[PDB]
Design a protein around this ligand. Structure first.
Ligand code: MG
Ligand code: ZN
Lengths: 104, 52, 225, 136, 468
RNA sequence: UCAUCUAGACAGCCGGACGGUGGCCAUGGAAGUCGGAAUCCGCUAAGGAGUGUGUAACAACUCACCGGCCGAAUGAACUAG
RNA sequence: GGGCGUGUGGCGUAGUCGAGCGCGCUCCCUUGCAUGGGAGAGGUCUCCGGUUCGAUUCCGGACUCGUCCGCCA
């Protein structure tokens, strides 16, 4: 849900037809003034590919940086990361089928 | 931004049409054949390409 | 203010306008923005005259102006001379100059007190300048540039000169004119500063492509704050 | 002319066809300009594209400094020497053909102009009027 | 017509300058009017004017402002147009407008606001709290041209009652201070001006100019309200603590010494108030900057910094008096800086500069900051000697030389040394010998009579007749 | 050549379009609708272990089926003048 | 214009889908009519896509080079 709040915030700033660098400066200023929604964001924004990046706590003090598409839901981005996981497994099985004949 | 209802009303006349593949004619969205003679009233129609 | 203005796209305002303390002259073929800049900034205290000199839209390079007097070339017609006589206040004196170089804005760089001229002007024209303008005259070149009016912008407070000017020439001209001078550029690096802009005691008007450091140099040397 | 024109120009009698060599009036170190093209000229069979006063041309430096030779550059005609009529009906002419070097936007490569220039050129190009000594 | 929502501002819940429920901020990124609010505006014509105001290009901005002004002029026709919604929006944009580089924009913006209040008198009261500080900042700006007309207009708005103008200072003092605080602490030069279209310089120049206006505002505020220091101490401490005001005092570079002069006046005011004594650390911070300033003053820029110097010296005397040249005490190199400064100052002497120097001397001798015979007297001799070279080729130098003599005679009376008196006599004769016109400087000559005794001068005449 | 048809057909409106059951595998999830197989009953006038939209999965909407109005022919595929 | 083939280290050159040698010179050792020896550096295998598990290697396209054939009375 908090990722959806961050997305709604960035999309509301986008829908004002505001300049991207001014949006990044607004994120920096609100991070300095201690807004949580701003402080969850990482500043090199990929608005050219409609993608933001967000910091999530690994343990419920280390934070991980995850890229979120603005045109899909947060659950839909999670399903994309699951899909990239699932495609990686099939290539690994193809490698395991390769190993014996290749090394022979 | 126009308004949502007003965008719908303008897109009813500008965007919700069909295009004949042979002669590029702008056609009614529920049409089955082109109304033009030069393509021979063909049934090769496609939806008009939307944005987004 | 150094006011950003164009003459229909032209970033050279000194070519198409002549600004003194007492009056202003603008070309007849001008845009609404170009007239509105002088009308808003100058106000109703200072007359603005739409004029043509010798049948030409260029008036700043054709004429040399002062608060006490105005100099016009020989080719200026009687209708233009009478219109300037009616539109101008009674204080200023308008006198035709009969001289071969004939482009007085290019030839003469002048202010209220002291003037720089082309070295090769005629002695009768020098005495005519000293009479009508009431201004002491020096024949000097700015680092070998004979067109001192085109290559210098001068006011009472200070002066802007050509960028490629020798420093020794800078203190020599500064001591000769009794004003501080700065070498600088106008209109995104154009060398012709006097053709680039017009200035007086409280206003400077320049082209739109004049950058912010150049505008800061202008307001610093002319003390417009 | 074309792009860098400040206003329009009345028709001046054309005096400089392709292949004409004119004096180089400015202080850029070039001695003469050789006209190979006229900007804005039309198309007719066998007709040479000719230039008048105030026109922008394409020219090469035939005689002058070697960094100016052997390349094409824009030029502006400032003295015509073929007599033309104004709308006040005086027929006037200089005694030589002369032009200056410029970029495609029209600002001068040089810094000062020797000799007179025409008012039909000085009104149309402000940089030429800026560096011009006498305008007639 | 207008789309998008200011969600981030909502998370903040900060009204900035505004007391009407709208964040008002000088910075470009935030405080822009809400799209929903913009939609609410009464007429399409107004909406367009606002959109144009948002756009970056100046010509468009000006055009829009001119249009807005015209609408205000026909108030009766457009009274419906002007509404609280309009006011909320205007206020948000007005702040950004006042910081605009272009003078016309600032002037017009101020004029518009004043006009609105005059027409909407007693209907703008909720919004007055936001507007008055801003209007005042315009009336108190370093540029005379923006400030003076604004001031005249403000007076007309309140029916030319001086008391009302003063009342504004008193009534909105809390608000005014808040504005000053926001510029000084909340703001940064980068926040004020967008980096892509502005260089590191200029942006720097701009922040300084705005802050300078804020300092000017503070001075008037202190003068108007005596208890302002006591009521606003916590905030004042914060404003003072920030290094920004202190950064303003740089003469090393920068076009205007006008800004520098303003800071000195503030420091002077603080000492007079006793606020600087109240927070000694703050006074020390200011003192250190003053020391840095002395280094900045240099021969290369002496011509540029010369008008400002007498003022620096007079202030220095007053500050030194506090805590026994305590100001000098903080810096081990204060003397070293003074020595360098003296040499630089002597090379070019401002009119009245020497009178200031003597006042500093009056202060210095009591705390013995400087050795008079080795340093003070000789430096002065060097200065008059330099003036003697500068005999009076240029204007005023004549006044300065006479002025120096008046000061030098006072310097000698204090010296009480035979060598010093002898040196003075030699210099006096030499000055006359170098020549000038006694008649031209007749007033100076009347002052000059003391150096050669009246009877001695008659004897002097006999010696002169004897001269070949 | 297949089908439907005064025991009410095809268009057009309006209403329902349900339970066992989130049927079995498989997935971090997939409940009619990512796929693999099966694809059966009840209540019925009638409703697919689903025609699409559809959500992370739901929810929701629509379908092909049955009903009121209409009262009589109509739908699909193909052939050749 | 068209066809056919070609492209490897600073240079030349070997490549069956699983980049070596020689020459230039880096260093060291070792010598009159100045050698030899030993460890070195050196490639986006012309480039871009697909196949494979991995392409110098297979395929498609582009660039480049080299050959061959081509206007009239
Ligand atoms: Mg031919
Ligand atoms: Zn068709």
């Amino acid at each position: 849900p908090l990722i959806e709040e961050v997305k709604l915030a960035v999309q509301g700033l986008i829908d004002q037809q505001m300049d991207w660098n001014t949006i990044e400066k607004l994120i920096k200023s609100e991070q300095k003034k201690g807004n949580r929604i701003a402080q969850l964001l990482n500043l090199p924004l990929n608005l050219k590919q409609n993608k933001i990046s967000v910091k999530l706590d690994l343990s419920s003090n280390e934070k991980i940086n995850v890229t979120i598409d603005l045109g899909l839901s947060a659950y839909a981005n999670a399903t994309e990361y699951f899909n990239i996981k699932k495609t990686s497994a099939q290539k690994q099985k193809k490698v395991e089928k390769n190993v014996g004949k290749a090394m022979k | 931004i126009i308004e949502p209802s007003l965008k719908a009303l303008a897109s009813k006349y500008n965007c919700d049409k069909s295009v004949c593949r042979k002669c590029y004619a702008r056609l009614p969205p529920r049409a089955t054949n082109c109304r033009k003679r030069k393509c021979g009233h063909t049934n090769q129609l496609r939806p008009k390409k939307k944005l987004k | 203010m150094a006011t950003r203005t164009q003459f229909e796209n032209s970033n050279e305002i000194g070519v198409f306008s002549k600004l003194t303390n007492t009056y202003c002259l603008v070309a007849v073929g001008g845009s609404e923005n170009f007239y509105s800049a002088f009308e808003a900034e100058l106000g109703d205290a200072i007359p603005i005259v739409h004029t043509t000199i010798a049948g030409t839209r260029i008036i700043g390079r054709m004429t040399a102006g002062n608060r006490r007097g105005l100099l016009v070339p020989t080719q200026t017609t009687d209708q233009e001379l009478q219109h300037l006589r009616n539109s101008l206040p009674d204080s200023v004196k308008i006198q035709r100059v009969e001289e071969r170089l004939s482009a007085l804005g290019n030839v003469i760089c002048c202010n209220d007190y002291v003037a720089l001229v082309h070295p090769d002007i005629d002695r009768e024209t020098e005495e005519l300048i000293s009479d009508v303008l009431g201004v002491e005259v020096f024949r000097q070149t700015i680092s070998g540039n004979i067109l001192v009016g085109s290559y210098c912008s001068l006011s009472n407070q200070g002066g802007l000169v050509h960028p490629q000017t020798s420093v020794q020439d800078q203190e020599e001209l500064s001591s000769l004119l009794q004003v501080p001078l700065v070498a600088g550029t106008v209109n995104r690096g154009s060398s012709v500063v006097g053709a680039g802009m017009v200035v007086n005691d409280y206003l400077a008007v320049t082209g739109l492509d004049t950058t912010a450091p150049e505008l800061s140099v202008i307001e610093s040397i002319f003390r417009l704050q | 002319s074309g792009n860098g024109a400040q206003g329009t120009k009345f028709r001046i009698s054309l005096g400089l066809p392709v292949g004409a060599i004119m004096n180089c009036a400015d202080n850029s170190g070039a001695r003469n300009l050789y006209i190979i093209a006229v900007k804005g000229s039309g198309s007719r069979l066998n007709r040479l594209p000719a230039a008048s006063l105030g026109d922008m041309v394409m020219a090469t430096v035939k005689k002058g400094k070697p960094e100016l030779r052997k390349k094409v550059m824009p030029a502006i005609v400032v003295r015509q020497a073929k007599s033309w009529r104004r709308r006040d009906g005086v027929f006037l002419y200089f005694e030589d053909n002369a032009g200056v070097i410029a970029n495609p936007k029209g600002e001068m490569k040089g810094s000062a102009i020797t000799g007179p220039v025409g008012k039909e050129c000085a009104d149309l190009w402000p940089r030429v009027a800026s560096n011009s000594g006498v305008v007639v | 017509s207008f789309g998008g929502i200011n969600t981030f501002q909502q998370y903040n819940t900060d009204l900035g300058l505004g007391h009407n429920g709208v964040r008002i901020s000088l910075n470009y990124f935030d405080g822009l009017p809400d799209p929903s609010l913009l939609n609410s505006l009464y007429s399409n014509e107004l909406k367009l004017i606002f959109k144009s105001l948002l756009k970056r290009d100046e010509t468009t901005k000006e055009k829009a402002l001119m249009d807005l002004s015209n609408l205000i002029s026909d108030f009766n026709q457009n009274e419906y147009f002007f509404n609280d919604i309009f006011l909320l929006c205007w206020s948000q944009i007005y702040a950004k407008l006042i910081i605009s580089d272009y003078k016309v924009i600032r002037l017009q913006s101020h004029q518009i606001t004043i006009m609105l209040v005059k027409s909407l008198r007693k209907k703008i009261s909720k919004f007055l709290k936001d507007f008055i500080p801003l209007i005042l900042l315009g009336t108190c700006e370093l540029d005379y041209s923006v400030s003076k007309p604004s001031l005249n207009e403000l007076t007309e708005c309140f029916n030319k009652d001086p008391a009302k103008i003063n009342a504004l200072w008193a009534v909105f003092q809390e608000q005014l201070l808040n504005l000053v605080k926001e510029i000084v602490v909340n703001e940064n030069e980068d926040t004020i001006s967008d980096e892509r279209y502005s260089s590191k310089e200029e942006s720097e120049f701009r922040y300084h100019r705005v802050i300078a206006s804020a300092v000017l505002l503070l001075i008037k505020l202190f003068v108007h309200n005596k208890d302002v220091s006591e009521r606003n101490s916590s905030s004042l401490k914060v404003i003072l603590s920030d290094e920004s005001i202190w950064k303003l005092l740089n003469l090393k570079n920068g076009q205007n010494t006008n800004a520098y002069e303003t800071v000195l006046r503030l420091i002077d005011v603080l000492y007079t108030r006793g606020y600087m004594p109240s927070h000694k650390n703050i006074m020390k911070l200011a003192v250190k900057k003053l020391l840095k300033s002395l280094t900045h003053i240099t021969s290369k820029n002496i011509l540029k910094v010369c008008p400002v110097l007498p003022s620096i010296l007079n202030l220095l005397a007053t500050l030194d008096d506090y805590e026994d040249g305590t100001i000098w005490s903080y810096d081990k190199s204060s003397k070293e800086k003074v020595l360098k400064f003296l040499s630089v100052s002597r090379t070019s002497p401002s009119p009245g500069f020497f009178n200031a120097v003597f006042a500093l001397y009056s202060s210095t001798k009591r705390h013995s900051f400087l050795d008079y015979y080795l340093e003070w007297l000789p430096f002065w001799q060097k200065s008059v000697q330099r003036l003697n070279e500068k005999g009076f080729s240029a204007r005023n130098s004549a006044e300065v030389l006479n002025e120096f003599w008046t000061n030098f005679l006072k310097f000698a009376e204090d010296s009480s040394e035979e060598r010093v008196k002898k040196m003075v006599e030699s210099e006096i004769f030499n000055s006359l010998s170098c020549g000038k016109s006694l008649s031209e400087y007749t007033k100076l000559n009347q002052t000059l009579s003391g150096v050669f005794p009246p009877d001695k001068w008659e004897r002097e005449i006999e010696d002169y007749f004897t001269s070949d």
